[PDB]
Amino acid sequence: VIPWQTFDETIKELSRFKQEYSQAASVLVGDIKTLLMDSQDKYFEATQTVYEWC
Amino acid sequence: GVATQLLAAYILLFDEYNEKKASAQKDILIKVLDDGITKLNEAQKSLLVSSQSF
């Protein structure tokens, strides 16, 4: 009359969805942030070198 | 610190044209500038790598 086992297992699958997706997402987001900072640094160096020549 | 004193010595000793220390002076200037440019470029590249490290 209270299928609490099935209820809890449902909640388990539901939570496990969001666990997996947070896990997959945040790593790649951090990779993006790294590449953004790297491109920034390359840009700074290139512009600096040009300006110093000019 | 060395550069600013060498250049002041250049201005002071060559207000006029002494022909005797003329040839040595060019050697001194070439030596100090070829040293300092290399120093500065290596320092900048090291700082760039240090910036990229984060």
Curated annotation (Swiss-Prot), chain B:
Intracellular or extracellular location(s): Secreted; Periplasm; Host cell membrane
Post-translational modification (record): In outer membrane vesicles, the redox status prevents formation of the disulfide bond, leading to oligomerization and pore formation.
Source organism, top-level taxon: Bacteria
Induction or repression: During anaerobic growth. Weakly or not expressed in most strains. It is activated by SlyA, while it is silenced by H-NS. Its expression is also regulated by CRP and FNR.
Role, per record: Toxin, which has some hemolytic activity towards mammalian cells. Acts by forming a pore-like structure upon contact with mammalian cells.
Family: Belongs to the hemolysin E family.
Quaternary structure note: Monomer and oligomer. In periplasm, it is present as a monomer, while in outer membrane vesicles, it oligomerizes to form a pore structure that is active. The pore is formed by a dodecamer.
Protein name per UniProt: Hemolysin E, chromosomal
Native source species: Escherichia coli (strain K12)
Residues of the full protein shown: 88 to 141 of 303
